[PDB]
Amino acid sequence: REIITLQLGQCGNQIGFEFWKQLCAEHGISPEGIVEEFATDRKDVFFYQADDEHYIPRAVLLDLEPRVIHSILNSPYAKLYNPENIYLGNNWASGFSQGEKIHEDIFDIIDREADGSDSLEGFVLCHSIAGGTGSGLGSYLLERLNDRYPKKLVQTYSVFPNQDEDVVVQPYNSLLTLKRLTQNADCVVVLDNTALNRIATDRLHIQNPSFSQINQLVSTIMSASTTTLRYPGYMNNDLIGLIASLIPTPRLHFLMTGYTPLTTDKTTVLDVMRRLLQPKNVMVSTNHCYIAILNIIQGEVDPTQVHKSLQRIRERKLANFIPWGPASIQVALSRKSPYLPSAHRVSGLMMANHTSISSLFERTCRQYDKLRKREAFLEQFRKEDMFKDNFDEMDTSREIVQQLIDEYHAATRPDYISWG
């Protein structure tokens, strides 16, 4: 419905500014907030209706030790948004305590936007896990939103720390943030930085500017999630109607991501469905089984080829699902976005609950367990000591993620009617 995006950390403010620039380029808006003569669309999903027909976007700009936020200010697109949400480290405990002291002022900032809106449906959190300023601060702030607002939804557009490492404190930070994500979030969209870097090196031969193209990829994915909301469709124009179909139980809420044009910075639909089932198109690097598969496409589509192609993917017998529940591959169609150049006309996206992410979680679990038992990589930091003299929250997060991996591998079995 109405969604306010929340951005924290330097990387998170970068990807939020990239998202707002992508939505300025997508919709008929100037970088001043002026409505254009070709703007009809719904623009009350992220844009607050301002007084001179300005669709001023709903953004909360929060920073911790700002360096790149000055460059975000140094732009003509910093006059498009920012309806007075302004405010002035490298560890999870440090960022957690730094958010802990300033919680009242940022909560007043959130409260201003909360009473300002007519309605609200979800919170978008854009920041990186174990990224320093994002980690710790994001987990504390996530605790505060779901403590304060149990009436709304939480979605997290996040990258997981899979970059093959010097910072050695990152698995502890990721596990603590992961405990907060498992019990205080309803949906987390997980991507691998290595798979995105492999695709970026596949399309062109870049070495250094991978991050900018990854920002564009997350921008297109985040706009692709709500294109059916901003532009009139039929179904999953409520976010919860989309989120409900993939999640069987509120511990398994992590979604695979795939996008079928891979040179992005006409074709038959069964072909791009089979293409989207590839891990070369999936943005994440024993037998694992999908729990539920639902896919989005917006582009040049034949309206009658949908039943032919869904029959063809059914009788292809290509994906092997989960034997306790009656899921389906669910085909949903959205509108291709106008007011922007329509190139690479067929564009599809998949959101599916797969147990293959349990292998990546188990790799991070094994790395955490090894570095924790060796105890030469946490190194007893003063922020970690002042946060916890006894260091039992890491053990609690270990217990939570051990339960999660057990739930994962029990869901892969046909015995998940009883709890695991």
């Binding site: 109607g241 409900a244 179909s245 309206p303 949908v306 039943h307 059914r314 009656p326 899921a327 389906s328």
Partner: protein
């Protein structure tokens, strides 16, 4: 209930609904009347509602005075599907306040709720294909004076035929009532008792797994129904 016994309390919600879509005071939003066809007296899986459209005179001789009633029929069919996405939303929202620090009783109760959302989410997506994409393909490229009456008379027949309201696909439609009624039992309980909703879930599984067999068998009698077996189960016997 005290309300919803007359065609004038829901009929003012219509003028309130039109403003919230930014589609009001247009000739498109002209000639809308809202009535009921039944007084609520029931697991009420039915929905009582009629919506009509009409146009000015020299176009109204083509848009017959019998077709608008069947528009009112297919409207109530889709709205009957919407009643599930209200009641299922209700039971998960009543469950939401019983969460953060959950136990076994929370997670297995949402484990029941998910697949009943999922069933309705794919049958609604099936009808949100048949009555909107394929029968619109042959009423958006089927508009080229008697021939216009003939093409429009094909459109309405295909919209009721591919919606499975017809008696040809009626055994597929009969099992859908058995799903919907168990959901209406599932909605009243939050927990008062956890196992009583589990009983309705275990019956719902039997009926879904049987709906597959009857809709696969009823292709011998339907090319449009070939899609529905594939919607409701995908790569699942």
């Amino acid at each position: 209930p005290g309300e919803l016994l007359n065609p004038l309390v829901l009929n003012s919600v219509l003028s309130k609904a039109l403003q919230c879509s930014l589609h009001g005071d247009t000739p498109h939003a002209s000639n809308l009347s809202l009535a009921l066809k039944y007084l609520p007296e029931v697991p009420d899986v039915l929905s009582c509602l009629e919506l009509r459209y009409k146009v000015d005179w020299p176009l109204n001789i083509v848009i017959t005075e019998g077709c608008v009633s069947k528009y009112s029929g297919v409207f109530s069919f889709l709205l009957q599907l919407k009643l599930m996405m209200w009641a299922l939303k209700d039971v998960c929202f009543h469950l939401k306040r019983t969460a953060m620090a959950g136990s076994v009783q929370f997670r297995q109760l949402q484990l029941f709720k998910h697949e009943m959302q999922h069933f309705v989410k794919v049958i609604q997506g099936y009808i949100a294909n048949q009555i909107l994409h394929v029968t619109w393909c042959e009423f958006r490229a089927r508009l080229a004076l008697e021939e216009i009456q003939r093409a429009h008379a094909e459109y309405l027949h295909k919209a009721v035929f591919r919606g499975l309201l017809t008696e040809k696909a009626a055994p597929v439609m009969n099992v859908i009532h058995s799903i919907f009624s168990l959901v209406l039992k599932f909605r009243s309980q939050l927990h008062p008792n956890f196992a009583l909703m589990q009983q309705s879930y275990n019956t719902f599984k039997y009926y879904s797994h049987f709906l597959f067999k009857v809709v696969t068998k009823l292709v011998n009698r339907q090319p449009h129904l070939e899609d529905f077996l594939l919607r409701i189960n995908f790569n699942n016997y």
